[PDB]
Every structure is written in C-alpha cells, then in structure tokens.
Amino acid sequence: RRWCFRVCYRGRFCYRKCR
C-alpha cells in the first residue's frame, strides 16, 4: 500500500515526508 514518501540518499540519508 502507498503512504508517505521519503527520499533516501544513495541507500542512505532519507528525508521522510508525509502529506
């Protein structure tokens, strides 16, 4: 299921973000 999208940085460093 889909829910909030977080961008990771090269398999590391992610910026969760729900909206």
Tab-separated table of C-alpha atoms in Angstrom:
chain	number	residue	atom	x	y	z
A	1	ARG	CA	0.000	0.000	0.000
A	2	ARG	CA	1.163	3.608	-0.507
A	3	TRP	CA	1.628	6.051	2.397
A	4	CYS	CA	4.041	8.993	2.780
A	5	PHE	CA	7.143	9.151	0.558
A	6	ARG	CA	10.722	9.523	1.852
A	7	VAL	CA	13.695	10.319	-0.416
A	8	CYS	CA	16.885	8.439	0.534
A	9	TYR	CA	20.450	9.431	-0.439
A	10	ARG	CA	22.262	6.540	-2.165
A	11	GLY	CA	20.789	3.801	0.055
A	12	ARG	CA	21.482	6.212	2.943
A	13	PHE	CA	20.269	9.551	4.363
A	14	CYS	CA	16.491	9.774	3.937
A	15	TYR	CA	14.046	12.656	4.428
A	16	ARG	CA	10.701	11.139	5.451
A	17	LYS	CA	7.718	13.314	4.451
A	18	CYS	CA	4.008	12.520	4.894
A	19	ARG	CA	1.257	14.716	3.396
